[PDB]
């Protein structure tokens, strides 16, 4: 006379990446160039309208 | 004289299993032959967040 163990189940997570998302449409990935920016604020962008 | 009877009909027995009706699609059946023997069993998940 016995008892039994019916099995063992386990979770398996598949991995989210940023690009695959959609919401990559609303911004633009660039490298990590900031060093040839100034001081970390922006580049003056003359604009002319 | 006489009197004669018309005709003697009996009822055709029907019968209906398990696995042929729709209600099957809840379960997953397995054929436990020795199940008497069974004390306790056991299912045991590990879910990783």
Redo the contacts between chains.
Sequence with gaps: ???????????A?QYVRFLETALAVSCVNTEFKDLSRMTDGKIQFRISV
Excluded: C
Aim: glycine letters at 8%; a neutral charge; zero cysteines.
């Design positions: 006379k016995f008892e039994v163990l019916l099995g063992v189940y386990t979770n997570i």
